Design a protein around this ligand. Structure first.
Ligand SMILES: Nc1ncnc2c1ncn2[C@@H]1O[C@H](COP(=O)(O)OP(=O)(O)O)[C@@H](O)[C@H]1O
Ligand SMILES: Nc1ncnc2c1ncn2[C@@H]1O[C@H](COP(=O)(O)OP(=O)(O)O)[C@@H](O)[C@H]1O
Ligand SMILES: Nc1ncnc2c1ncn2[C@@H]1O[C@H](COP(=O)(O)OP(=O)(O)O)[C@@H](O)[C@H]1O
Ligand SMILES: Nc1ncnc2c1ncn2[C@@H]1O[C@H](COP(=O)(O)OP(=O)(O)O)[C@@H](O)[C@H]1O
Ligand SMILES: Nc1ccn([C@@H]2O[C@H](COP(=O)(O)O)[C@@H](O)[C@H]2O)c(=O)n1
Ligand SMILES: Nc1ccn([C@@H]2O[C@H](COP(=O)(O)O)[C@@H](O)[C@H]2O)c(=O)n1
Ligand SMILES: Nc1ccn([C@@H]2O[C@H](COP(=O)(O)O)[C@@H](O)[C@H]2O)c(=O)n1
Ligand SMILES: Nc1ccn([C@@H]2O[C@H](COP(=O)(O)O)[C@@H](O)[C@H]2O)c(=O)n1
Ligand SMILES: [Mg+2]
Ligand SMILES: [Mg+2]
Ligand SMILES: [Mg+2]
Ligand SMILES: [Mg+2]
Lengths: 213, 213, 213, 213
C-alpha cells in the first residue's frame, strides 16, 4: 500500500535537507503524528550498537561507519517490510555526538508515502526492490567534504583533523566502493541538493498526486 | 504562456525517444494535429544551410555539425520567443541523409507545453532562460556511440567508417567542450534514456498537471 | 631473474600496440627469436578452453570473456613463476576467430625483460606482485569501442551487430566491475596508447638501462 | 639546449614534492648553485603583484588566485625562453603568507634540465610547446582538499573557514574550467604523488640518462 521512495547520495550531499524540504512543502509538519501521510526514515537510525572497544576507536575517528556492516541491515529490511504491510513501527534514534543509540524512539504510524534516505539505501537488492522510486542526490566529493567538515565541527563536536582522518581512511574509500556503484540504480539524479527547488517541487507535486488518489 | 521544457544530453543519449515517450504516454498521438497540447521541437530542425564547400566536407564526414556555430541560434531564439508569445510558427525540416533543409516547413500551432530537445539546447543563456524546466539525459559515451552507429546506418544513410571517423574527430571533442559543460544547468538528470520509465512518468505526471491547471 | 612489466587497460586501449612499439624501438624485431632480450606475453593466450555449451553462446556473442573466470589464472601464475625462475616455457596460442586454443604452442625462452599485457593483468594479487613495474593504458571508453569495432571486424571475424551487443552486455559492465578498479595498482598511467611517443620512449629508455645493467 | 619538463596537477596534488624528490635523488642539492644541472621553477613564483584592494580581498580569501589572469604569463614565457637560450635568469620569490612578491630573488644559472611546475603549467599553448615532456600529478579533489586544509593552516597561517570558502568559490571552479582540460596534453600521468617511488625513479633515471649524454 504505502509508496516507498528511496533516497541516496554521499555523506553531506543534501539527502536529509531534500527530504525535510519535501515533507515541509507537503504540509506534513502540521499534521498530527498519528495521522502523518508522508514520513522520513533515515538509514543512520539503524547504526549498530558499538562495543566498548569500537566506541573507543570511534572517539578517535578510527571506526568504519561507512561500510555496510556498520548498519543493522536486518532491522532495516524488517522495518521497511512491516511499514509496507501498514504496521505501526518503532524506529531507534541515533546520537552522532556520542556514537550511540538513544533510549527515546520515534513511533511511525501507517503512512501513504515513505522517504527512506541513507548513504547506502540502494546497496541491498532486497531493500532496493521495495522502492517504487529511487532518487540520488549527486554532489561532488570535494564540495561534500567541505560541508561535512563544517557540519561535524559545529553540530557533532568533532575535531577537524579527526574528521579529515576518518574521511580519508574510511568515508572516501567506502563511498567509492559501496555507494557509487549503486548510483546506476537511481531513476532520477538530483543535483544541487536542497537548493534545487525545481526538482524538489517536482517530487512534491508527484507525492501530492499520489496522496489525492 | 506555454510551459517550455528544455531537454539536452549527448548525441544518441535518448533525447528524441524520451520526448516521444512522454507525448505518447500523455495520449497526444491520439489527438488531431491542430488539437495537440504538447508538442516536440528538435534543435536539429535549425541546422544552418550549408555552403557548397561545407556540404562537400559533410559528405566525407569532415564538417563539424557539433559546434554551436552549426546551428542558427538567432532563428532558434526568434522562433522560441514567438512561441512564448503564443504565435503560430513555421519551422524547417532537416534531412540528415542529404545534410540539407527541405522545401516544406512544419506548422507549429500554440500548445500548452513545448518540449525543445537538442545536443546544445542549454548552450545559449537567452535560450536557456526561456525554459521553465531543464532535463539532461545522461547516458555513457560508449553506450551512446553504439546507439549512434546503428541509428546512423539505418536512418541517416551513413556508413560505419565515416560515422566513427566523424565521431572521434568532431562529435566527441565537441561534446566535451560544448555539451557536457551545460549539464550543470539541468534541474533533473535522467539516466539511460527512454527505458527509464519512472523518470519519464514523473515528467508525464508533471505535464498532465499543467494541462489540468 | 627477469624484470617483469605488467600492462593493463580496457579492451582496445592500446596495450598490444604499446608493447609492440616498445620492442620495435628496442630493435628486438631485428634480433633472432632465440636471442630476444625483451618478450611479450598476452593474457589472451591464457583464455580457458570452452565447453560445448560455452562455445555455442560465444558464437552468438553471449559468453562473458571479460569475467576473471574466463582466464586460467592458475596457468598464468604457474607460467609467470616459471619464467621468473628462468625456465623455458610453452604457452598456448589463442584464435579469436574460433574462440579456441590452437594445437601449436609458443616457446618462450629466458629473456631479460618480459612484458605481460592483458585487460585483467592486475586482477590477481599474486600475479600483480610478480611485476616490478605496472603500466595502465588509459583510453576513453568511446574511443576504445570505436577501435574495437574496426579491429574485431578486420581481425577477429566478427560482425558489427554482435560486437556492439557483446560490448554493451558483457564488456562494458565487466570493465567497470573488474578492470577499472585495478587501475589504482599502476605505477604509471599512459594515456591514449601507441601514439604517445614520449611515454613509450620513457619505458624504452628504462628497459635499455636494464639491458645495459 | 636545456630539456624542459612541465609538471601540472591540481593544488596539493604533490607537484612540489615530486619535483623536490627528483632533484634530491639526482644529487643536485649538493651541487654548487652556479653549476646545478637540474633546477625547479614554480609557476607560483610568477603570481602578480596585488593592488591594495586586491590584497584586502586576498586576506579574506576573496581573491581568485586560480584564474590564468592571476599569473604574469608574459614573464613566465619570457623567462622560459631565456632559459632555453642558455641565459642566466632571475626568478621572483612569492610569499603565500602575505600574498606578496618578496625582495629576495633566486638566480638560475644555465641548466641541462628544467622542471617547471604549476597548477596551470599546460594552460598556454606557447608554454606547452616549450616542454619536451609533460607530467600530470593526478590526485583526487577531495584528497587534495584535505591536504590543502592541513597545509594552509599549518604553513600559510590561513583560517579553516576562509580556506574552505576560497576553495569552493574559486579553486574548485577554476581547477575544473582551466586545469582539468589541460590534462589531455600530459604524456604521463603520475598517481599517488610523491609516494610513487616507481614513477619518480623512472623520471630520475631518464634525466640522469639525459645528463650523461
Ligand atoms: N545546497 C547547500 N548549500 C550549502 N550547504 C548545504 C547545502 N545543502 C546542505 N548543506 C549543508 O551541508 C550539510 C549536509 O546536510 P544534509 O542535508 O544533512 O546532507 P546529507 O543528509 O546527505 O548528509 C549540512 O550541514 C547543511 O546545512
Ligand atoms: N534503452 C535503449 N536500448 C537500446 N537502444 C536504445 C535505447 N534507447 C535509445 N535507443 C536507440 O538509440 C538511438 C539514440 O536515439 P535517440 O532517442 O534519438 O537519442 P538522441 O535524440 O539523444 O540522439 C536510437 O536509434 C534509439 O532507438
Ligand atoms: N592512436 C591510434 N589511432 C587510431 N587507431 C589506433 C590507435 N591506437 C591503436 N589503434 C587501433 O585500435 C585497436 C586497439 O588495438 P590494441 O593495441 O591491440 O589494443 P589492446 O591491446 O588494448 O586491445 C587496434 O586495431 C589498433 O591498431
Ligand atoms: N603522498 C602524500 N601523502 C600525504 N600527504 C601528502 C602527500 N604528498 C604531499 N602531501 C602533503 O600535501 C601538501 C601538498 O604538497 P605539494 O607537494 O606541495 O603539492 P602541490 O605542489 O601540488 O601543491 C603538503 O603539505 C604535503 O606535505
Ligand atoms: N557515529 C557515527 C555514525 C556515522 N557517522 C558518519 O555519518 C555519515 C552518514 O550520515 P550523513 O548521510 O548524514 O552524512 C557516514 O559517512 C559516517 O562516516 C559518523 O561520523 N559517526
Ligand atoms: N548533417 C548532419 C547534422 C547533424 N549530425 C549529427 O547529429 C547529432 C545531433 O543529433 P542527435 O542528438 O539526434 O544525435 C550531432 O552529434 C551531429 O554530429 C550529422 O551527423 N549530420
Ligand atoms: N573469444 C574471445 C576472447 C576474448 N574476446 C574479447 O577480447 C578482449 C580482450 O582482448 P583485447 O585487450 O585485445 O581487447 C575482451 O574484452 C573480450 O571481450 C572476444 O571477443 N572473444
Ligand atoms: N596568495 C596566494 C596565491 C596562491 N594561492 C593558492 O595557491 C595554489 C597554487 O599553489 P599549490 O600548487 O602549491 O597548491 C592555488 O590553488 C591558489 O588558490 C593562495 O592561496 N594564496
Ligand atoms: Mg544527513
Ligand atoms: Mg535525436
Ligand atoms: Mg590486445
Ligand atoms: Mg606546491
Amino acid at each position: 500500500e504505502p509508496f516507498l521512495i528511496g533516497v541516496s547520495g554521499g555523506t553531506a550531499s543534501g539527502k536529509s535537507s531534500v527530504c525535510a524540504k519535501i515533507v515541509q512543502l507537503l504540509g506534513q509538519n502540521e499534521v498530527d503524528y498519528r495521522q502523518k501521510q508522508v514520513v522520513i526514515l533515515s538509514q543512520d537510525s539503524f547504526y549498530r550498537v558499538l562495543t566498548s572497544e569500537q566506541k573507543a576507536k570511534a572517539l578517535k575517528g578510527q571506526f568504519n561507519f561507512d561500510h555496510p556492516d556498520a548498519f543493522d541491515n536486518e532491522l532495516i529490511l524488517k522495518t521497511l517490510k512491516e511499514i509496507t504491510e501498514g504496521k505501526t513501527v518503532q524506529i531507534p534514534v541515533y546520537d552522532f555526538v556520542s556514537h550511540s543509540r538513544k533510549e527515546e524512539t520515534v513511533t511511525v504510524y501507517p503512512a501513504d508515502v515513505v522517504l527512506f534516505e541513507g548513504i547506502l539505501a540502494f546497496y541491498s537488492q532486497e531493500v532496493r526492490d521495495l522502492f517504487q522510486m529511487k532518487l540520488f542526490v549527486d554532489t561532488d566529493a570535494d564540495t561534500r567534504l567541505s560541508r561535512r567538515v563544517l557540519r561535524d565541527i559545529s553540530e557533532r563536536g568533532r575535531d577537524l583533523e579527526q574528521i579529515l582522518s576518518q574521511y580519508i581512511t574510511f568515508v572516501k574509500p567506502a563511498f567509492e566502493e559501496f555507494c557509487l556503484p549503486t548510483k546506476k540504480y537511481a531513476d532520477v539524479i538530483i543535483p544541487r541538493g536542497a537548493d534545487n527547488l525545481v526538482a524538489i517541487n517536482l517530487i512534491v507535486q508527484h507525492i501530492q498526486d499520489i496522496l489525492n488518489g
